[PDB]
Coordinates of C-alpha atoms and ligand atoms in Angstrom, one line a residue:
X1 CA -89.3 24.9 1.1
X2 CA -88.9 21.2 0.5
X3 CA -88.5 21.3 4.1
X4 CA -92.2 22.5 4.4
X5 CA -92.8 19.5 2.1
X6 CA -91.4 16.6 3.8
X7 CA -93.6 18.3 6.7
X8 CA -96.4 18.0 5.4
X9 CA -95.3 14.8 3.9
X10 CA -94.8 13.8 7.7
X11 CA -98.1 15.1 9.5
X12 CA -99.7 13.3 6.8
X13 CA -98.2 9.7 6.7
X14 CA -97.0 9.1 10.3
X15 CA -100.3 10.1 12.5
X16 CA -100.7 14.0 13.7
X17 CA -98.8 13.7 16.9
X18 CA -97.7 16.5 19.7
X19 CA -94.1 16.0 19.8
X20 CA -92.4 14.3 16.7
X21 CA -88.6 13.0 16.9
X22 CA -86.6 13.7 14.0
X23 CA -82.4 11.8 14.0
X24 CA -79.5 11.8 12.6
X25 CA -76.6 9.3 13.1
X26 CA -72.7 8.9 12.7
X27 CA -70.3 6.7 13.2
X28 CA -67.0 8.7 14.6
X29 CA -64.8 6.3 13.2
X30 CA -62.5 9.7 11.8
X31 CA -63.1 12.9 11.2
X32 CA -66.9 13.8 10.5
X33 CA -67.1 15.6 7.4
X34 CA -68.9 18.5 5.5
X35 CA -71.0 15.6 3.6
X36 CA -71.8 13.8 7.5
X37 CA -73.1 17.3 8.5
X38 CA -75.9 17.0 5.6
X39 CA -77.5 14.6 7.7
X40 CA -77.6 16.5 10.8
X41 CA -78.6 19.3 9.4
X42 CA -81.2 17.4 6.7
X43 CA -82.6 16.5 10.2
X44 CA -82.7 19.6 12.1
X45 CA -84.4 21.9 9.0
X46 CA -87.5 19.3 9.0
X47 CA -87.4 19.4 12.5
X48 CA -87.1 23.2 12.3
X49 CA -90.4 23.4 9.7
X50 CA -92.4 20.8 12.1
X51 CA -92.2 23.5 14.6
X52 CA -92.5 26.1 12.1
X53 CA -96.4 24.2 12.5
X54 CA -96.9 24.7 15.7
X55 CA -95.5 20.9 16.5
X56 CA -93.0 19.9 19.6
X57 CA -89.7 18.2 18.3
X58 CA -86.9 16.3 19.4
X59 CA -83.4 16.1 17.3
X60 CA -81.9 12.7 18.4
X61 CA -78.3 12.5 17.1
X62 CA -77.0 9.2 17.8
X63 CA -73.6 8.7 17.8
X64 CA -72.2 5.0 17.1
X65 CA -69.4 5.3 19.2
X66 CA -69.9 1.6 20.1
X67 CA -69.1 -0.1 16.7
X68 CA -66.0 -2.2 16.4
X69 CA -62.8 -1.0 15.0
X70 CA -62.5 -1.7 11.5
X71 CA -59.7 0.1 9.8
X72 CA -57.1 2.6 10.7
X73 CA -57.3 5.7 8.8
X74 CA -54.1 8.0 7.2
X75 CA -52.4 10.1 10.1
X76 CA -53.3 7.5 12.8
X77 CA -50.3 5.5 13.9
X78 CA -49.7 2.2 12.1
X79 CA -49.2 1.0 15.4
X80 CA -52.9 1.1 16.4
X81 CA -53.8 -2.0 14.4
X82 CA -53.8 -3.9 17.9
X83 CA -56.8 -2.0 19.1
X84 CA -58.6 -3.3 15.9
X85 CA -61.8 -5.3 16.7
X86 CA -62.5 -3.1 20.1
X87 CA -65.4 -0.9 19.8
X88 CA -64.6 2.7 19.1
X89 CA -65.8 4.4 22.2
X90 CA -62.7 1.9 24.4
X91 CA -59.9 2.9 21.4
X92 CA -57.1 4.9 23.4
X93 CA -57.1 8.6 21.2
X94 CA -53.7 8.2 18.7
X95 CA -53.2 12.2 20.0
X96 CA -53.8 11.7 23.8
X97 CA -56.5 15.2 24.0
X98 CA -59.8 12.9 25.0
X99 CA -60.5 9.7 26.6
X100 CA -61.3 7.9 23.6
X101 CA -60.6 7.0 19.8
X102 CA -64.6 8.4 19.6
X103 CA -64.3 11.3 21.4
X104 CA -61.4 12.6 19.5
X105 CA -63.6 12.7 16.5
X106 CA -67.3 13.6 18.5
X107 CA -65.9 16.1 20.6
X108 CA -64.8 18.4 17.0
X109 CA -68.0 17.7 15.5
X110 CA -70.1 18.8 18.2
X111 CA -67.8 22.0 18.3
X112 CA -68.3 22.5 14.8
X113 CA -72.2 22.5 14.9
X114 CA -72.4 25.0 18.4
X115 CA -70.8 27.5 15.9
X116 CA -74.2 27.1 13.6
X117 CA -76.4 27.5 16.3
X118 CA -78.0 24.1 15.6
X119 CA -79.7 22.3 18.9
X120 CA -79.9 18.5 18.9
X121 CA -80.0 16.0 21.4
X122 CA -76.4 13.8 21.3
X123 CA -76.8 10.1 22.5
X124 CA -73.9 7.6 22.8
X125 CA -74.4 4.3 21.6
X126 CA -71.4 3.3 24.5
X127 CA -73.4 4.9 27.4
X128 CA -77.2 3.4 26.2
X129 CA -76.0 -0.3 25.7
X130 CA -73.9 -0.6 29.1
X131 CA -77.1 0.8 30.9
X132 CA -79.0 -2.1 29.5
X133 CA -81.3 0.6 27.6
X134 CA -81.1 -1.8 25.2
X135 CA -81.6 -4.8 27.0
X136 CA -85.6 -5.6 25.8
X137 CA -84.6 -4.9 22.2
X138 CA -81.9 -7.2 22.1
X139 CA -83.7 -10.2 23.5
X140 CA -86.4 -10.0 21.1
X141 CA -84.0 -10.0 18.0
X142 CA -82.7 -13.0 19.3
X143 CA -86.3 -14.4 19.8
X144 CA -87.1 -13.5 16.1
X145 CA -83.7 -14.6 14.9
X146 CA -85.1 -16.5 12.1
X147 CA -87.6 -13.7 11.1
X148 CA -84.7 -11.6 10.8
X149 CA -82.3 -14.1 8.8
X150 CA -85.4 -14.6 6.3
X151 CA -85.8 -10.8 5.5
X152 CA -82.2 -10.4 4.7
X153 CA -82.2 -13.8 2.8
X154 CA -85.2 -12.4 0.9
X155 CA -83.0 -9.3 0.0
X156 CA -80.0 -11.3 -0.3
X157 CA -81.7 -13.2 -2.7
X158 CA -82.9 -10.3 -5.2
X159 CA -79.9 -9.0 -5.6
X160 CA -78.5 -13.1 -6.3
X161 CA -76.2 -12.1 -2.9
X162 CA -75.2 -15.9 -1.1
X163 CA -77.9 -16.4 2.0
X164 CA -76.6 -15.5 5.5
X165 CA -74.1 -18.3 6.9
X166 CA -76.2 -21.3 8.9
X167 CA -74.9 -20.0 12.5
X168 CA -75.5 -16.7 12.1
X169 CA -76.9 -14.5 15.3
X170 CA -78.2 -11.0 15.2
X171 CA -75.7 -9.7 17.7
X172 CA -72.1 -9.7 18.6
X173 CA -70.4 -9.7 21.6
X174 CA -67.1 -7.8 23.5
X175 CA -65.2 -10.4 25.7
X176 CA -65.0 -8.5 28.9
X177 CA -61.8 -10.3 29.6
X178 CA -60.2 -8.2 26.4
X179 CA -63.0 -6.4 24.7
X180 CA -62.3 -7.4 21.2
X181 CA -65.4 -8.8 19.3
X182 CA -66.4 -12.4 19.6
X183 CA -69.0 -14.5 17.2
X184 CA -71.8 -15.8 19.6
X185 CA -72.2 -19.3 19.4
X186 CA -75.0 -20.1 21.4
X187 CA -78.5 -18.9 23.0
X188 CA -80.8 -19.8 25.7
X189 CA -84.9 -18.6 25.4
X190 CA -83.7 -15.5 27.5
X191 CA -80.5 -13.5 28.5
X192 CA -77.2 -15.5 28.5
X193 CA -75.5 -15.8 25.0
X194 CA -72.7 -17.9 24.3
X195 CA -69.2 -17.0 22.7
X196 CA -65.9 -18.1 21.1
X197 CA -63.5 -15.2 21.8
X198 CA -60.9 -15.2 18.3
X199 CA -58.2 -17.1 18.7
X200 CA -58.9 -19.9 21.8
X201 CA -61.6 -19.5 24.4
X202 CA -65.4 -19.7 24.9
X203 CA -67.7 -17.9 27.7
X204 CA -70.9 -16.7 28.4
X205 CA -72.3 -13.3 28.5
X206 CA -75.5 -11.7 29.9
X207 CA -77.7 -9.8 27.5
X208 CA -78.5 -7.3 30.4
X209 CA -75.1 -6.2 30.9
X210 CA -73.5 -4.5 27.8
X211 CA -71.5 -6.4 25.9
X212 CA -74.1 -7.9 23.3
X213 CA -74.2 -5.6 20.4
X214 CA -77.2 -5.7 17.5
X215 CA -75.7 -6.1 14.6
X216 CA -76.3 -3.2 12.1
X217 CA -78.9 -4.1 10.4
X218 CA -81.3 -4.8 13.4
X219 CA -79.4 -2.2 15.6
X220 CA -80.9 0.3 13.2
X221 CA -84.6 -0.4 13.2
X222 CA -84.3 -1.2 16.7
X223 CA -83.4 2.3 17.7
X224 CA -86.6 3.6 15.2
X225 CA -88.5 1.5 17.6
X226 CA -87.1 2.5 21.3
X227 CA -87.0 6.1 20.5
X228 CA -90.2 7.2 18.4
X229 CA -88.1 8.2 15.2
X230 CA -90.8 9.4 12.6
X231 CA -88.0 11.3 10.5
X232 CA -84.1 10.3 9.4
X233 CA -82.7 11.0 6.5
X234 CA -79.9 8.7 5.1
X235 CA -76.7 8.5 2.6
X236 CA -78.0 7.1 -0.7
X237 CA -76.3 3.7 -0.3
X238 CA -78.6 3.2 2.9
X239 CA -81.6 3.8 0.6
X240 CA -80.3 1.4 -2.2
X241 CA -83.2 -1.1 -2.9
X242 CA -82.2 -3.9 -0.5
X243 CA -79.8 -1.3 2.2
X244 CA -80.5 -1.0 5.6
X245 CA -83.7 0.9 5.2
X246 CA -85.7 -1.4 2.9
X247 CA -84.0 -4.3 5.0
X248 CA -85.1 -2.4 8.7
X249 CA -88.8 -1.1 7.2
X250 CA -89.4 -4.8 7.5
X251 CA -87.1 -5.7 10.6
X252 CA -88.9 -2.9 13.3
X253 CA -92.8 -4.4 12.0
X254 CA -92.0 -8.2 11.8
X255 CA -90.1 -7.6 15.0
X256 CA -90.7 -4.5 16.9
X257 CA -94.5 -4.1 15.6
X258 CA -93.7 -0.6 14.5
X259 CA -93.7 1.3 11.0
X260 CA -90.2 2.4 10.2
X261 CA -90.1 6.0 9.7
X262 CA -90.3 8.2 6.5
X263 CA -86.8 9.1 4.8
X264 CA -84.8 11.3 2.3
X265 CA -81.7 10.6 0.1
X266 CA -79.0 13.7 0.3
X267 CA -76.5 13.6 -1.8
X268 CA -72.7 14.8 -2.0
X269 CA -70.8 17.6 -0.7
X270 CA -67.7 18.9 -1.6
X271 CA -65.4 22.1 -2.4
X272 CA -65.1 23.3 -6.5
X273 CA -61.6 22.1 -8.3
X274 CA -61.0 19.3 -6.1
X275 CA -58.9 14.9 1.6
X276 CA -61.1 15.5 3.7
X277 CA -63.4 18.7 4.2
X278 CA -64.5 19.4 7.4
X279 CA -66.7 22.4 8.7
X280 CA -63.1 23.9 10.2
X281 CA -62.4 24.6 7.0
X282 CA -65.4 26.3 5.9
X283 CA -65.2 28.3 8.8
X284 CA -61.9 29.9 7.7
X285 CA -64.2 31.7 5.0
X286 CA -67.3 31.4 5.5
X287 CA -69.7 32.8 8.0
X288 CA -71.7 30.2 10.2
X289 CA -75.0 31.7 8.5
X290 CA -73.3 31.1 5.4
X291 CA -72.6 27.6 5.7
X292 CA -76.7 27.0 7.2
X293 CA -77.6 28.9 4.2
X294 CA -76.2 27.1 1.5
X295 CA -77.5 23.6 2.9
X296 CA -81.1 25.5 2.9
X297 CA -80.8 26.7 -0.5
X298 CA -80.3 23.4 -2.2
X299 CA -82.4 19.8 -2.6
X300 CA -81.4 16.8 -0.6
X301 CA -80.6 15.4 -4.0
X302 CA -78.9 17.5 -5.6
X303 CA -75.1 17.5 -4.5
X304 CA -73.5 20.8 -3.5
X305 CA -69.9 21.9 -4.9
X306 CA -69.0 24.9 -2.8
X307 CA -66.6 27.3 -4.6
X308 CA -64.0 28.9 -1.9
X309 CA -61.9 30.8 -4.8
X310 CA -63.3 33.4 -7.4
X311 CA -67.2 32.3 -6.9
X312 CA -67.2 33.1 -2.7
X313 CA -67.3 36.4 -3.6
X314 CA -70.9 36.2 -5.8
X315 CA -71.3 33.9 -3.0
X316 CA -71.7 36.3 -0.1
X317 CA -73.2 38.8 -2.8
X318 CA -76.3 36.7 -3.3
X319 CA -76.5 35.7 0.2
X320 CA -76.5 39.3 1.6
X321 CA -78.9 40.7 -1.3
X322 CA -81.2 37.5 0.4
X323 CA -80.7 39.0 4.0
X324 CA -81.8 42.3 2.5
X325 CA -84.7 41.6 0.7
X326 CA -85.7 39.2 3.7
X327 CA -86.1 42.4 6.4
X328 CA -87.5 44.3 3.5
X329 CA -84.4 46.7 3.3
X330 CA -84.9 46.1 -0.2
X331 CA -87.2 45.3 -3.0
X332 CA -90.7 35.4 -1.7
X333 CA -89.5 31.9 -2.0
X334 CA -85.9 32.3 -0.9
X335 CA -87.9 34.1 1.7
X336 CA -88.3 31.0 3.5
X337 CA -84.9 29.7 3.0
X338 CA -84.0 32.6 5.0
X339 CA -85.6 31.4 7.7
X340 CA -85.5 27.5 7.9
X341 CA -81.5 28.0 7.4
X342 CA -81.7 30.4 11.0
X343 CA -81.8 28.3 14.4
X344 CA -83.1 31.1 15.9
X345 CA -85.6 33.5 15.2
X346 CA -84.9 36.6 12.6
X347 CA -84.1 39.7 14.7
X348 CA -82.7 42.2 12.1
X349 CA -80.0 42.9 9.8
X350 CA -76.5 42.8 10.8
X351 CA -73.8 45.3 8.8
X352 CA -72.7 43.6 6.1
X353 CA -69.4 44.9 4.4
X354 CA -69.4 43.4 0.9
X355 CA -67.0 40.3 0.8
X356 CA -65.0 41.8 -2.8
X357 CA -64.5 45.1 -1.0
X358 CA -62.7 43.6 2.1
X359 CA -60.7 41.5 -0.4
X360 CA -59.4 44.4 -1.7
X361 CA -59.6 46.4 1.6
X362 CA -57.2 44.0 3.4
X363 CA -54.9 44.4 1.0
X364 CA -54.0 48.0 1.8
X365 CA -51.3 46.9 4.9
X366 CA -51.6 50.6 6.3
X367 CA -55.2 50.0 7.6
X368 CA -56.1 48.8 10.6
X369 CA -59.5 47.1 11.5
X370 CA -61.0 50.2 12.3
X371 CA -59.7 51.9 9.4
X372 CA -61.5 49.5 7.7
X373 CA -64.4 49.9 9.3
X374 CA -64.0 53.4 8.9
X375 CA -64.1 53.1 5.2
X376 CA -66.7 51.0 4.7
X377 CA -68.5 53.9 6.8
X378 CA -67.6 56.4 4.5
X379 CA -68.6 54.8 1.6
X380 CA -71.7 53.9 3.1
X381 CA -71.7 50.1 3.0
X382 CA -72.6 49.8 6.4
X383 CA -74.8 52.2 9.4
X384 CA -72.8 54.8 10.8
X385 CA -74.4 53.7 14.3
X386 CA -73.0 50.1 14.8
X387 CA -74.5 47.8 17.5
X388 CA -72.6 45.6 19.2
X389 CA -73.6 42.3 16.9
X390 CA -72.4 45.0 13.8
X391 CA -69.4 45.4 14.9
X392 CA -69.2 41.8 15.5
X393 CA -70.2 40.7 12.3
X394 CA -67.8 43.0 10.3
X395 CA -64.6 42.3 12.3
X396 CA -65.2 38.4 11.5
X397 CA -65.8 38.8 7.9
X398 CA -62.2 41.1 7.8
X399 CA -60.4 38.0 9.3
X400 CA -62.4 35.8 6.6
X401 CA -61.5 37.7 3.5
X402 CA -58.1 38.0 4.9
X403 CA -57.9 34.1 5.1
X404 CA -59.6 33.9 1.4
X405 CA -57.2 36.5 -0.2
X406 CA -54.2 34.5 1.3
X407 CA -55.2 30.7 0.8
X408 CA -58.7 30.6 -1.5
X409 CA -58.1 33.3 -4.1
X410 CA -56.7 33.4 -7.5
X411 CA -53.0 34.5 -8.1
X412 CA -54.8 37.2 -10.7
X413 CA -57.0 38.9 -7.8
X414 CA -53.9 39.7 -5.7
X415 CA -52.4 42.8 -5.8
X416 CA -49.9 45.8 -4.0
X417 CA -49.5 49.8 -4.4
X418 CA -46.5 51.6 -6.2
X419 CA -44.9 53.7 -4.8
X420 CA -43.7 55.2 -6.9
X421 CA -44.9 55.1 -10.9
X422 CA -43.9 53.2 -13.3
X423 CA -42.2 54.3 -16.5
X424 CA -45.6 53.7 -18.7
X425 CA -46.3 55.0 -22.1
X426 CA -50.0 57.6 -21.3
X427 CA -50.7 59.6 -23.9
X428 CA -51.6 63.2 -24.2
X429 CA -55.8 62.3 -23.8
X430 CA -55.3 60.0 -20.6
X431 CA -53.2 62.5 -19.2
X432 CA -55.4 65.7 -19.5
X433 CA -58.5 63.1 -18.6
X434 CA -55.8 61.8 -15.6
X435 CA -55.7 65.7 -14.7
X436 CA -59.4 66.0 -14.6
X437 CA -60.1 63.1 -12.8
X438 CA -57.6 65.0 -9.6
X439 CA -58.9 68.3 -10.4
X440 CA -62.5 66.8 -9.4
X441 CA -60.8 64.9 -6.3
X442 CA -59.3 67.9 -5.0
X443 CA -62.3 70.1 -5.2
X444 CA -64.5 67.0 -3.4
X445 CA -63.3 66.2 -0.3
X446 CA -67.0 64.5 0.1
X447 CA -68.2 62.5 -2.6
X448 CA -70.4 59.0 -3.2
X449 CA -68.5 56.2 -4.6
X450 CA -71.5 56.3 -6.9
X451 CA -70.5 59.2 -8.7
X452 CA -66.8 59.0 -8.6
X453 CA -67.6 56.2 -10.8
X454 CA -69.4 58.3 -12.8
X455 CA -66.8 61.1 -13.3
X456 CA -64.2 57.8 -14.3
X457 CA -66.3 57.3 -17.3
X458 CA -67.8 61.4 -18.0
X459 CA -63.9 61.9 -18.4
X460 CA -63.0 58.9 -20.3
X461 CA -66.1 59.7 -22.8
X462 CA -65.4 63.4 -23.1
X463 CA -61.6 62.8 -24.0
X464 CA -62.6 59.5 -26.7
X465 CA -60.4 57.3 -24.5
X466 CA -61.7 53.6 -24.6
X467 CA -61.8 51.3 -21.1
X468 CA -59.0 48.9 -22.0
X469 CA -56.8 52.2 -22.3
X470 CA -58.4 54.1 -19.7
X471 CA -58.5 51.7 -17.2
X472 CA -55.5 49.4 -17.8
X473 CA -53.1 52.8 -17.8
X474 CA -54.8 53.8 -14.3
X475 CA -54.6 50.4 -12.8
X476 CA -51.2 50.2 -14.3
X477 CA -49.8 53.5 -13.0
X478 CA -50.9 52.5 -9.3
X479 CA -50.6 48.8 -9.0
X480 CA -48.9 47.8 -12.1
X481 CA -51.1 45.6 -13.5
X482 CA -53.5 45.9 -16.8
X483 CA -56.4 44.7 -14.5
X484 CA -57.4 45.7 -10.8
X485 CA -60.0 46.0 -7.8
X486 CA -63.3 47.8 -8.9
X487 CA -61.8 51.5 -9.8
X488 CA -64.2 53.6 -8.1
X489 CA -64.2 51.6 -4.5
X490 CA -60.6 51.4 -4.6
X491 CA -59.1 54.9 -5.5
X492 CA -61.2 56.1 -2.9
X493 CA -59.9 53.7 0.0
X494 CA -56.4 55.2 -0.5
X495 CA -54.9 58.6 0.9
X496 CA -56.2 61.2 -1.3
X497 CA -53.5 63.4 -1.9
X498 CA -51.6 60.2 -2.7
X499 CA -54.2 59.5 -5.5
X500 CA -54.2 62.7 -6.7
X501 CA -50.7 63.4 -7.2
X502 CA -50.4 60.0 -9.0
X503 CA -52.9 60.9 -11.3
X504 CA -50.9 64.3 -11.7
X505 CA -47.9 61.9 -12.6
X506 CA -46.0 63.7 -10.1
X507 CA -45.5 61.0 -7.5
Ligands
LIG601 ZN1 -58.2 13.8 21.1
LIG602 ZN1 -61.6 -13.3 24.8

């Protein structure tokens, strides 16, 4: 829904256009992260509601592939140090899979987001500068040079920050001869810049080619201006009073004659009891719809803390009960959610096998995936007639709570069958309500989970047997444990004659 706002919020201030461009930006200097992705996807759910008004729109997602090389991350060879100063996009890869340092870390974030579904537009920083897409741009931040040194002096100054040094330029430049960055020293009216490679040298480089690279600050603003951005949403410490956007809302008028375009704060995003996250490792457990969902469901502002142990399982609960009530297959806000967290349209319900269940499920060795699917048949969690996109659906979830149970989940939640019984003290109640309980199983070959788990409690009730005895002694006698899966679901997953004659205490 606040979507829907910041729609409204952006037919209203920018004009009513027919196409509107929405972007997102990233800098693959390492891994692109769960918290990167907000942007992206911050991005793409306005864009999403601008069409959801009849509107045309175009995702940019700019990729800065073409900034210097700071620092060298954990994991990367030490020995790397010597590319420092080159722009990304011309950094060997430290594991030899892509052309480039940048690609290394574009290609697995563009994989990531074809798993969501999400459509965007990726542009390289590298491929628009060496085309001279840039070239106009670039000349006119050097013909405003002082314009753009008094903003940030003015900001500068607010914040009591020392005023940009005397021979400061609004670009930088990549010696051809060894395509480290260089501090331009000099200017002409047009084209030709001036520079003093580190170290000893001096040269001159042509604007037009593509070695004279904004600086941030203008670099920014500048892109607002080439391509129509009228939406991009930004980490807080770009929105920070005097940041690159308060700095570039002045930069793209005073310069580029254009009004910088309307922004959003997003905060945080991180896993619960807790470097790096990436979307990988959401994928190991959570569905792609999943993952859209839970950046739909929350504000741009308020951080999200996704729980991958106990709390994925109320997790899938809530978002299924959402799916359900969505097509109606059950008994209005969250309605929308549904929707703006879906690249695609909504075609219909796909079986969805209760996360908890297949926890417990997968944890019976002597069933195989269509034993699984079997029960879940049986027990009437999902259609008896299963498309192709059903079958689809379940046989991913399996391998997800598979991965949960064996990386995400509590020690508490795991457990195994006996056997054979333990020696257990069960007194003379629990056992006559243990015999009913088998007499009722062997008469009902067919049954509802429903009211199995009725019967569990008729029997306990009838014999005045409370639930810490009468379900510790059943969980204990078959997995030897006080506490266990849901009773009802679980007894009847397992081979009955197996169940019955543990129940019988006879095996
Ligand atoms: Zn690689
Ligand atoms: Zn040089």
């Amino acid at each position: 829904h606040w979507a829907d706002y910041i729609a409204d919020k952006i037919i209203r201030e920018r004009g009513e256009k027919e196409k509107y461009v929405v972007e997102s930006g990233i800098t693959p200097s390492g891994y692109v992260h769960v918290g990167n992705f907000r942007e992206l996807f911050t991005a793409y759910i306005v864009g999403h509601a601008l069409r959801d008004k009849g509107y045309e729109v175009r995702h940019i997602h700019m990729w800065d592939d073409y900034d210097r090389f700071r620092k060298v991350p954990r994991n990367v060879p030490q020995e790397w140090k010597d590319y420092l100063g080159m722009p990304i996009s011309e950094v060997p890869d430290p594991w030899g899979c892509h052309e480039s340092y940048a690609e290394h870390f574009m290609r697995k974030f563009e994989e990531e987001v074809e798993k969501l579904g999400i459509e965007v537009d990726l542009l390289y920083a590298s491929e628009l500068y060496k085309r001279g897409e840039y070239s106009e741009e670039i000349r006119l931040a050097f013909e405003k040079r002082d314009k753009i040194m008094e903003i940030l002096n003015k900001y500068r100054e607010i914040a009591k920050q020392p005023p940009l040094p005397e021979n400061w330029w609004p670009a930088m430049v990549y010696c051809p001869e060894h395509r480290r960055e260089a501090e331009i020293i000099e200017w002409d009216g047009g084209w030709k810049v001036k520079y003093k490679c580190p170290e000893g040298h001096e040269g001159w480089v042509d604007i037009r080619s593509g070695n004279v690279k904004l600086r941030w600050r203008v670099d920014w603003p500048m892109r607002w201006s080439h391509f129509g951005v009228d939406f991009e949403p930004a980490g807080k410490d770009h929105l920070v009073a005097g940041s690159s956007y308060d700095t570039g809302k002045e930069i793209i008028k005073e310069v580029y004659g254009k009004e910088a375009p309307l922004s959003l704060m997003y905060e945080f995003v991180g896993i619960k009891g807790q470097n790096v996250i990436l979307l990988s490792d959401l994928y190991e457990v959570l569905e792609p719809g999943l993952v859209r969902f839970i950046y739909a469901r929350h504000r741009p502002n308020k951080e999200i803390k996704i729980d991958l142990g106990l709390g994925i399982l109320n997790l899938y609960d809530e978002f299924e009960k959402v799916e359900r009530i969505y097509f109606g297959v059950e008994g209005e806000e969250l309605r929308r959610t549904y929707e703006l967290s879906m690249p695609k349209k909504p075609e219909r319900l796909v079986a969805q096998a209760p996360f908890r269940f297949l926890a417990v499920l997968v944890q019976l060795p002597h069933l195989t995936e269509e034993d699984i699917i079997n029960v879940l048949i049986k027990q009437g969690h999902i259609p008896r007639d299963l498309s192709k996109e059903d079958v689809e659906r379940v046989k991913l979830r399996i391998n997800l709570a598979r991965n949960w149970v064996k990386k995400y989940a509590p020690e508490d939640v795991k457990f195994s069958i006996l056997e054979k019984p333990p020696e257990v003290e069960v007194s003379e109640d629990v056992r006559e309500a243990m015999n009913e309980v088998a007499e009722w199983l062997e008469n009902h070959e067919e049954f509802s989970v429903e009211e199995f788990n009725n019967i569990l409690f008729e029997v306990a009730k009838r014999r005045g047997i409370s639930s810490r005895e009468w379900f510790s002694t059943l969980y204990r006698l078959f997995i030897g444990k006080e506490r266990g899966p849901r009773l009802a679901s679980f007894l009847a997953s397992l081979d009955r004659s197996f169940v019955i004659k543990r129940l019988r205490l006879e095996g």
